[PDB]
Structure formats: structure tokens, C-alpha cells
Symmetry: C5
Subunit: 205 residues, 5 copies
């Protein structure tokens, strides 16, 4: 639409993706969930698991709201993430950079609510030695902001799903849990929340 | 051409490649098809198939049409895709990033019709356990827009091609079917169409 | 010299590297040749050949001429290819991205004649099954413009060279031939020329 | 933050990340320490060690201090390192480029103190031949500025931390020391300091 | 605060694509390779994997500065992307160079530039002799890709093998370096190169 150009133009001049959109005495709440799609491989020598997963990330950016009457037909837009502030969520125990599989686009509606749903493949340090047993091997995937504490970035978890897990895999799921925690570090007196996805899996047969 | 040089000039000042060129509540229709070239490898252990294929993609961008009377002998132009809006089609079940092998340019005519034909190598999740049997392995290669629903981006299919299939590969191409679906998801009120290419193949000998 | 700087400044102000420098119905002729340097490897299981080769491309860009008067001591200059229009030659049957080994600069002279001479490593689809036989394996390295038909870009060949081929390779060269063909594709009305280099090689011992 | 937008804007407008924040007769002091997280692998044939570690770098950049009265609510911010001057620290005996695993953001406070804490995977040259003996292999990970001598960049160490060392790898930690040295080089009139992290480890029984 | 204004002048009044020659006089660049480690050899495919240090230096007359105008500035550390740098190609490389160090060069007030990258690269080489007393010999050949000798005068400095790792499986037999120059049938001007040569063999 013609308004669409107008909207994106405003994004270039009148917005900074480096600025965390906190609002006085209020952190930015980001919602986070992980859906495991496939355990690609394990390395029992190097203690690594290779996984493909779908992240669901959402938050409100008050700077990203616009007036519907000003851009009539425009309700939500598809935006390159590079143009937007994005939570600096890090995989604490990853041992490779993430490979993002999908278009690096996010949805933004007129209230400034952003959803970023990337599919990702990444390797993680894990004790995978129990993988050929009945109890399986348990890998914890730990995520959290690298630089923002809880009063600036309130990480919350959404309910996760094993429904997307590939059925014809050589690994079967014995269990999964997802939990939010909040721990202090020696440096700063503010805590840093984390969301941990724990998967227990074993070889079929 | 010199009267071809001004045409490109209009691209920069006016046009935004982030903006899907929907007209007045009419979706952008993209015609989509795949030519299979070579099945490079399968991974029986990790359930992966590695393919090389061309995507034929075409659509009309009404922001990209020009008065042919105003520009003498310019019937069409070759434009870098980074200067153009392109459909954010993703391979839903890919486990690797697409490796684009060809120059990243699209053909645009004065109707604003755009043609983009990349050659791609990509690895997909697939049950390849039957590959050595007479019935062989059947892989679904499923594509759709990552962020746009059918009212915005209407994905339609054209005839798939296999004439370009390599005849000296170790895999015999049994068959290939293509189908379009228009499905609602639990998340949104709008359907998101997909085109799926089903490839049945098996080891020769 | 202190005129190169003015010469380069003119490039930015007026020149568009996406515009193909055609004239009054005249296509840009580009002279093309490939020199085979080394056959790196073969994959007999996946039907792939890995080659390092030197491409020679030359053409005249009528927008890149300058009067030697207004730039006294400037015979020729070395320009980043990103500042120039360059032919979008693709290896039709590659199955990997080209790895350009050398600096990405072309030479341009006062009459707008441009020379671009990259050294490249790339993997191609090829029936290498006869490699250990007397007959050997034959591979076709096929190159052409990805988006410009024969009336826009006239691809012509020049003499081929094997003097540059490594003598200590495990692969013995037998024959190298080149030819120019003009052929039709489903997408398009007009013919697209190609130059194909045919390599026949075999193991020693 | 209304005041954060101002601060980030001022960074772009009135700061050059290419300039080392040395003062009038005074070097920049950078504090540096390496925390070993996991020895991923060793190659006894090529003499390499593959390690994952967490670096702590901090220094004061006097051009990054700000008056709190001009930015009332703002005590510290997370800034992309690309926007900052950062110490050009290189691993002397590295044989691969660093794979930075974490978000490339540093914390800056109002007195210009910067903290950058990347997680890194990187391969180093090392005599790993004693890895299966009781004594173990000893690897030196040596770091220093690549272009700045001690009078412009003063490199100092901090207390080490092996409390993050993965307990379930096939390698056990024997000895781990860290020392600062100030070597001279035949070229330059000026000495160049280095920090060296020495790991002794062996294969578990 | 003075380096600040140096970098500012560099932005408006300098094009890094322009070779800093003068009135009919080439830019001389000095070049030397120091071998650090032979990482591996491929005996089937005829390839050697090496890690080395390149010393490159030259004078860019556009990069000199009045020492009066900037009091306490001896040398500055500058991103190579902001400077003209020689387009030196490895003629017989079979992979892209992997640069291991920060991409910065030193420039002083005379406009002398020093660029010292450390690099991992793979080259075509006959390594069939690597297990013999005489050993394998590999040539590492470097030269400008687009500038003839009357524009870019490549000259060589003495190499260095003191930086060579003592604990690899390869002992060094012999090392040498030489400057060369030839006319190519194609072009009117001659072109120079510097070739570094190693001879090495497995230990034990
Ligand atoms: C980054 N770090 C904290 C950093 C911090 O506050 C700090 C630490 C040390 C000194 C000064 C500040 C903030 C919250 C995330 C946490 C991550 C964890 O450290 C870590 C380090 C290395 C590997 C895995 C995980
Ligand atoms: C790509 N195609 C033509 C298509 C075009 O004009 C084009 C190219 C790129 C972008 C937009 C349009 C141009 C010349 C190369 C040729 C290759 C052949 O079609 C082909 C593709 C797939 C299977 C068999 C044959
Ligand atoms: C992204 N998703 C649709 C739904 C949506 O955006 C969404 C989903 C859930 C919540 C909010 C939005 C949009 C169209 C593509 C589709 C893909 C599929 O989800 C999917 C997820 C994970 C792996 C493979 C495929
Ligand atoms: C680079 N060199 C010093 C000297 C300098 O910059 C230099 C040398 C010679 C000429 C111009 C500048 C600066 C501090 C680091 C030191 C590193 C060591 O050389 C070295 C060389 C090769 C591999 C590993 C280490
Ligand atoms: C690149 N080439 C010359 C090329 C030139 O000026 C030229 C050639 C042909 C036409 C017009 C100009 C310039 C100086 C270096 C020389 C290198 C060697 O060719 C070569 C080719 C392929 C692999 C390794 C080496
Ligand atoms: C950030 N702004 C600025 C302003 C002025 O409020 C406006 O009119 C629209 C936007 C905006 C642009 C793009 C997106 Br996505 C969200 C908000
Ligand atoms: C899993 N974690 C999180 C924790 C415990 O908070 C921490 O500080 C370090 C790691 C960690 C362990 C191993 C590797 Br490899 C990376 C991170
Ligand atoms: C978008 N425009 C604008 C205008 C003014 O209508 C015109 O004359 C031409 C173009 C245009 C520019 C590049 C391409 Br490709 C297509 C159309
Ligand atoms: C094949 N698909 C598409 C579908 C059915 O839409 C879906 O919801 C998820 C996948 C899919 C399968 C495997 C992997 Br790995 C990733 C996505
Ligand atoms: C872009 N032009 C055009 C014009 C106006 O003739 C001129 O002054 C010089 C050039 C030019 C710039 C760079 C190169 Br290389 C060649 C010609
Ligand atoms: C070998 N060719 C050239 C041809 C016939 O022109 C074409 O259009 C496609 C291919 C080709 C075949 C297999 C693979 Br994998 C890639 C390209
Ligand atoms: C670099 N400046 C300039 C100035 C004018 O002093 C100011 O007000 C704030 C900053 C500054 C901006 C961002 C960061 Br982080 C640190 C200091
Ligand atoms: C670790 N160093 C630094 C030192 C000792 O100053 C030197 O001269 C060379 C090296 C070095 C070691 C291995 C490799 Br690979 C590269 C450089
Ligand atoms: C580009 N110049 C020339 C000039 C304008 O005369 C001057 O005053 C200083 C510089 C210059 C800038 C950066 C570096 Br490094 C070297 C010289
Ligand atoms: C090393 N050279 C340079 C030389 C001798 O001038 C030539 O003509 C070809 C090569 C060369 C040899 C092997 C490979 Br692979 C690439 C280039
Ligand atoms: C995450 C978020 O902000 N969503 C809220 C939701 O809780 C609320 O009920 C709804 C209508 O106000 O939309 C908004
Ligand atoms: C204008 C608009 O749709 N506002 C929405 C709200 O209704 C929704 O609940 C929220 C999270 O989905 O995103 C915002
Ligand atoms: C897709 C589209 O909108 N255009 C079609 C095109 O297939 C056809 O070639 C042309 C004939 O004039 O018009 C119609
Ligand atoms: C202006 C022009 O050249 N006409 C055709 C148009 O009819 C066709 O639909 C389109 C897609 O093929 O390409 C163009
Ligand atoms: C392609 C081209 O235009 N080159 C010709 C070339 O054959 C000739 O030898 C030379 C004479 O000036 O230049 C002209
Ligand atoms: C006047 C002039 O430079 N003509 C040249 C000619 O020497 C050659 O045919 C080719 C290579 O430069 O391009 C043109
Ligand atoms: C205003 C302010 O907080 N300044 C701090 C200082 O207190 C602290 O010693 C240093 C290291 O964390 O960082 C800076
Ligand atoms: C040197 C610097 O900038 N910061 C120091 C900080 O590290 C220290 O803990 C404290 C004094 O005790 O504040 C100051
Ligand atoms: C090569 C170069 O440009 N630099 C030289 C340097 O070798 C010499 O030491 C110096 C003596 O002042 O003169 C200058
Ligand atoms: C003013 C100044 O320091 N000029 C130096 C010169 O003395 C030195 O020989 C050369 C590096 O060799 O760099 C330049």
C-alpha cells in the first residue's frame, strides 16, 4: 500500500534499533519459547549435540506503535530484524554460531508488538554419554540476555511444544522441561533471568 | 542504453524493497515452481537429503512498471534482487541455509512483471530409510512465505520440471508430484498458502 | 596520479554498475575464455568434479571511456568490480558457489575496454565414473549470462590455454575443447548463448 | 529512553571508533582475562587444540564518559562494539579466526568504562603430543595488541577462572597459569606487552 | 584530541581505490613471508596448508601529514579498508586467504604504511617427496594482480624462519625467496612477483 512506504520511511529516520525500549520503572518483557524440530546428531567424543529448533520471541516496543488513522489499511508489517531493536538473547552453552534457516523478518503490529519466529540450527556442549541407554542423555539448552538484567529485560517463557518434532528421527524424546530461573552473578547486584530447555533423549532400538 | 540509465535512477529515490507491492487490497500473486537437478546425497543416519534445484518465481510489482513510450528501446532490465521486493519464501523443512549458486539478479519488464530463477543447493529433513528399496524414499520439499498470508501474497504453482534432471546420478528419479495447499493456522485469522514438491527416488542397482 | 582521483570521482557521480552498456541495438560483446589450472578432486559417489580455473573476460563499456586530454597521464586504471558493470556469467552446472581466489578488480582503459581475470575454485556436476579408465572422464564446464540474451550480451570465445595446467596432478589431461552455442529455454523467447569447455581426463599409473 | 536516544545519537555524531582513546601522555589500560570453558578437540597429527573460552576485557575510554545531569536516568547502556573503539587484541599462535559465539555488545557506563565479555571458539597451534601421558599436554594461548605498543595500550591481566570448565569432557585440567610479559621486537623501538594463558591438560582414564 | 581530525581528513580527501603513484614513478612495496607452520599436506590432491606472516610496506604520499599541525602524533593504526593497499594475489593458492589478525596498518607522518597480516592459506604443491630425505618443495608465489612494475614496483625483504614452530611433524630442509619479473604475451608492460620456496620433510 501507499501508506506502507510512508510507514517504513519513518522507520529509517525516526527510530534507533540500538535502544532498548524500556519505559521508566518498567523493563521490556520478552516472551520466549523453543520448539525442538530435530536432533541432527551427537558427538560422544567431543560432547556436543546438534539441534534444529524453532524459537518464538515476542515483545512490545512502544517506539514501534503507529496511528491506524494515519496509515489506514496497515495493521501489521513484515520488517527486517536489522531495522528493529531485538533482545540480545544468547545461548549460554552453545559452541557454534547459530545458523538461521528462515527469512530474518519479524512481524510488527500498530501497538508496536513484535514477533520474531526463526528456525535455527546450532550445536551445544552436552554430556551425551547416556544416549544409548533407556534413561537417555539429558541436554540443557540455556538462554538469556547477554547484557540486560531483569529490571531492563524481563525474560518470560511461553509454553513449548514437541508437536513439531520429526517422527522418523533416530532419536526419541524421553522427556522435556522448560523453566525460567533468575540468578545473581558476582559483579552486579541485579539478577539475570534465564530460560532453560531440558531435553532427555535416546537412540531408537 | 542512455534512456535505460534514467530508468534505474527512479529505483533508488522512490522504491523500498522492504515493502510488499500489494495494490488496493489485492494480493501479490507469485507463481512458483521447482526443477530438480541432482540429489547430491542422502544421510541415512541423520535423515537428510541434499538437493540442487532451480526455483522459478514470478510476480507483478506495480511499482516497477514504466511508460515504454517514455523510455525508447528498453523492453526489460536486469536488477539486483537486493534492490527489489522479493517473496520471503522459505523451505519449511530445510535443515541448512540455501546456497544460491547463480547471480542474484531478476528480470523486470515494463509491465512490472518480475522473473527470478535461482539455482539452489539445500539440505532437507527427510525419511530416507527406504532409499535402497524398490519403493524407495519419498521426500517432501515444502515452501511458503514466512511472514505473509494469502490476502497479501497469493502463492500459486506452475508445472514442475524434471527434464533437467541429471541422468548419471546414483539415484533414480521414480516420480515427482507438486501440490498447493491454502491452510489456516491456530495463530492467525488468515490462511498461509504452501507449495509442496514430493520427490520419490531410489538407489540405482 | 592527481587525475585518477578526478577520474574515480566521475565514476561515482554518473555511472551505474547495474546498467548493461549496450548501444543502438548493439549488444555488448564479451570475449570469454577458461584456463584449467588444476583438477582438485573427484567424487565418484556423488558425481562431482572440483576445479581451479582462470577466467578471462573482456568487453568494451562505452560509458567508461575518457579523453586522454582531460586526464593527461592516465592510460588505464584498476577498479573494484563493484563499481563496474560486469557480465553476469553463471556456471550452469555448478553445484557449489564460486570461490574467487584473486582480488576483485578489473582493468579499464581510456577507450572503455575492460578486462576482468579472476582465478576461481568451484565444484561441478559431472559423470566422473570413467576416470580410472583409458577413455577417462569427460566434464563439461558450461558458462553463460544468467539474465541477458544474445541481443543484449554477445558472448564470444577466444583461444584456450592448457599451458597453465599443473603437471604434478594425479590427473592426466587428455583433451580440452571449447565451443559457443546458442540455445532456447522455457522462460524466454530469445536465445541465450553459452560457452562450454569440455575436459577429458584420467588417472595416471 | 528519551535520554538513551540522545546518548546513542551523540555516539554516532561525536565519536570515532577508529581512534584509540589515549590521553595526553597516558595510555589506555586494558584489563584482560581468559576463562576456559571446554577443550573441544586436539589434533595430534597437525598439532592443534580447539578451545571454547570466555574473554573478559575492560578499559576506560575517556571519550565515552557522559554527564549524568544531561542523561538523568541513564547509568549504563549496551552498545554494539562496531560503534566503539575496541582493543585490537590478537591471538598470536592462533591458526583459525575467532568464532564469536555471543552477542557483540559491550556495557558502557557514564565514566566511560567499557566491558566486553565475548564467548569464543578458536583453534591454536600447540604441542599436544603429551596429551595421553600423565604429565599432559601444555598449551600456551598468547594474546597481545597487534599494532599498539605499551605506551599507547597498556595490557594488564585479571584473576583467572576455571570454575566454568565443563566437568564432562574427555580432558581433565592439570595446571592453568596466566602471566604478563613485556617483550621487545627488532623492528620497533617500543616494547609490546602480552598476556599468556598456559593450560596443561590430559586425557581422562 | 588530534588523531580525531587526522581520520576526518582521511574521509573527505582520500580515495583508497587510487594507487599512490607520482609523476611517472611507481609505488615501491616491500614484501616478505615468514613461515610459521605447515599445518598439513594432501598427498592425493597435491596441496599444502600453511600459516604465515606477511610483511608489507610502502609509501603513500597522500598519507603524509605536517607534523606541526598534529603535535604528539607519531603513527596511527588505521583500518586497511580506509587505505590503498597493494592488490597482491597468491598465484597458486587454491583457497581464499584466511586472515588471522586485526586488519589494521600503521601509517606515520611520512606516509609510510606497514601492514603485517598473519594468514592461513592452502596452495597447489607437489608434495609427493615429503616422506623422502630430499623432501617436498613448494613454491609460494605472490604478485600484484592488476598493476605492472612501472606502477607497482614489488621488491623483496629477507624472509624469516625463526618464527617456525619447532614441534610439527615437518622439519625444514631449505628456504629461499626471489624477486622475478616477466612480460606476458597479453600486456605491454612487464609484471613482477616474489616467490617464497620451502623444502620440508616428515620427521622420525
Ligand atoms: C554475561 N554473564 C554476565 C556477565 C556479567 O554480569 C559480568 C561478569 C563478570 C564481570 C563483569 C560482569 C551477565 C549475564 C549473562 C552471564 C553469562 C555468563 O557470565 C557466562 C559466561 C561464560 C560462559 C557462559 C555464561
Ligand atoms: C536461467 N535461464 C534463463 C532464465 C532467465 O531469463 C532469467 C534468469 C534469471 C532471473 C530471471 C530470469 C536465462 C539463461 C539461463 C537459463 C537457464 C535455463 O532457463 C534453465 C533453467 C532451469 C532448467 C533448465 C534450463
Ligand atoms: C511461520 N509459520 C506461520 C505461522 C506464524 O507465523 C505463527 C505461528 C505461531 C505463532 C505466531 C505466528 C506463518 C507462515 C509460515 C509458517 C511456518 C510454520 O509455522 C513452521 C514453524 C516451524 C518450522 C517449520 C514451519
Ligand atoms: C606484530 N608484532 C609486533 C611488531 C610489529 O607490529 C611490526 C613488526 C615489523 C615491522 C612493522 C611492525 C607488534 C605486536 C605483535 C607482534 C607479533 C609478532 O611479530 C608475530 C608475528 C607473526 C606471528 C605471530 C607473532
Ligand atoms: C593476471 N596475470 C596478468 C593478467 C593480465 O594482465 C592480462 C591477461 C590477459 C589479458 C589482459 C591482461 C597480470 C599479472 C599477473 C598474471 C597472473 C597469471 O596470468 C596467472 C593466471 C592464472 C593463475 C595464476 C597466474
Ligand atoms: C517509529 N515510527 C515513528 C512515527 C513518527 O510514529 C510514525 O509515524 C511511524 C513509526 C513506525 C514505523 C514503522 C514501524 Br514497523 C513502526 C512504527
Ligand atoms: C551452562 N552454562 C551456564 C552457566 C552455568 O550459567 C555458566 O555460567 C556457564 C555455562 C556454560 C558451560 C559450558 C559451556 Br561450553 C558454555 C557455557
Ligand atoms: C518507480 N518508477 C517511477 C516512475 C516515475 O513512474 C518512472 O517513470 C519509472 C519507475 C521505475 C524505475 C525502475 C524500474 Br526497474 C521500474 C520503474
Ligand atoms: C514439513 N514441515 C512443514 C509443516 C508441516 O508446515 C510444519 O508445520 C513443520 C515442518 C518441518 C518439518 C521438519 C523440520 Br526439521 C522443520 C519443519
Ligand atoms: C563517468 N565518466 C564520464 C565522464 C563524464 O566522461 C568523465 O568525466 C569520466 C568518466 C569516467 C570515470 C571513471 C572511469 Br574508470 C572512466 C570514465
Ligand atoms: C548442464 N546444465 C546446462 C543446461 C543444460 O543448460 C541447463 O539449463 C542446466 C544444467 C544443469 C544440470 C544439472 C545441474 Br545439478 C545443474 C545444471
Ligand atoms: C561521545 N559522547 C559525546 C558527548 C557530547 O559528550 C555526550 O553527550 C555523550 C557521548 C557518549 C555517547 C554515548 C556513549 Br555509550 C558514551 C558517551
Ligand atoms: C606465540 N608466538 C609469539 C612469539 C613467541 O612472539 C613469536 O615470535 C611467534 C609466535 C607464533 C607461534 C605460532 C604461530 Br602458528 C604463530 C606465531
Ligand atoms: C588526506 N590527508 C591530507 C591532508 C588533507 O593534507 C591532511 O591534512 C592530512 C591527511 C591525512 C589523513 C589521515 C592520514 Br592516516 C594521513 C594523512
Ligand atoms: C604459480 N602460477 C603462476 C604462473 C607460473 O605464472 C602461471 O602461469 C600459473 C600458476 C598457477 C599454477 C597452479 C595453479 Br592451481 C594456479 C596458478
Ligand atoms: C502480549 C500482549 O501485550 N498482548 C496483550 C494481551 O494480553 C491483551 O489481552 C490483548 C488485548 O488488549 O492484546 C495485548
Ligand atoms: C492493534 C493490535 O492488534 N494490537 C495488538 C493486540 O491486540 C495483541 O494482543 C498484541 C499481541 O498479540 O499485539 C498488539
Ligand atoms: C501473468 C500476466 O499478468 N501476464 C500474462 C502473460 O502470461 C502473457 O504473456 C501476457 C500476454 O500479453 O499477458 C498475460
Ligand atoms: C510490456 C510487455 O513487455 N508485456 C509483457 C506482459 O504482457 C506480460 O504479461 C509480462 C509477463 O510475461 O511481461 C511483459
Ligand atoms: C577488441 C578491440 O577493440 N581491440 C582491437 C585490437 O584488435 C587491436 O589490435 C587494437 C588496435 O588499437 O585495438 C582494437
Ligand atoms: C586506444 C586503446 O586503448 N585501445 C585498446 C586496444 O589497445 C586494445 O584492443 C584493448 C586493450 O586495451 O582495448 C582497446
Ligand atoms: C559512574 C560509575 O558507575 N563508574 C564506574 C565505577 O564506579 C567502577 O569502578 C567501574 C568498574 O565497574 O566502572 C565505572
Ligand atoms: C579503575 C576503574 O576505572 N574502576 C575502579 C574499579 O575497578 C574499582 O573496583 C573501584 C575502586 O575500588 O572503582 C574504580
Ligand atoms: C624505505 C623507506 O621508505 N624508509 C627509509 C628507511 O629505510 C630508513 O631507515 C630511513 C632513514 O631515515 O629513511 C627512510
Ligand atoms: C617521520 C618519520 O618517522 N618517517 C619515517 C622514516 O624515518 C622511516 O624510515 C619509515 C619506516 O621505515 O617511515 C617513515
Amino acid at each position: 500500500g501507499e501508506f506502507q512506504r510512508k510507514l517504513y520511511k519513518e522507520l529509517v529516520k525516526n527510530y534507533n534499533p540500538d535502544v532498548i525500549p524500556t519505559q521508566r520503572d518498567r523493563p521490556v518483557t520478552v516472551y520466549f519459547s523453543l520448539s525442538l524440530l530435530q536432533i541432527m546428531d551427537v558427538d560422544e567424543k567431543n560432547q556436543v549435540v546438534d539441534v534444529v529448533f524453532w524459537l518464538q520471541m515476542s515483545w512490545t516496543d512502544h517506539y514501534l506503535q503507529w496511528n491506524v488513522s494515519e496509515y489506514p489499511g496497515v495493521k501489521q508489517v513484515s520488517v527486517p530484524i536489522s531495522s528493529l531493536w531485538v533482545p540480545d538473547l544468547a545461548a549460554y552453552n552453545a559452541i557454534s554460531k547459530p545458523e538461521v534457516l528462515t527469512p530474518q523478518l519479524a512481524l510488527v503490529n500498530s501497538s508496536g508488538h513484535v514477533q520474531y519466529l526463526p528456525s535455527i540450527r546450532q550445536r551445544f556442549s552436552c554430556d551425551v554419554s547416556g544416549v544409548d541407554t533407556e534413561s537417555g542423555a539429558t541436554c540443557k539448552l540455556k538462554f538469556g540476555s547477554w547484557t540486560h538484567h531483569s529490571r531492563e529485560l524481563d525474560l518470560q517463557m511461553q509454553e513449548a511444544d514437541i508437536s513439531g518434532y520429526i517422527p522418523y528421527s533416530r532419536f526419541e524424546l524421553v522427556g522435556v522441561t522448560q523453566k525460567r530461573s533468575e540468578r545473581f552473578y558476582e559483579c552486579c547486584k541485579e539478577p539475570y533471568p534465564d530460560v532453560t530447555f531440558t531435553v532427555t533423549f535416546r537412540k531408537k532400538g
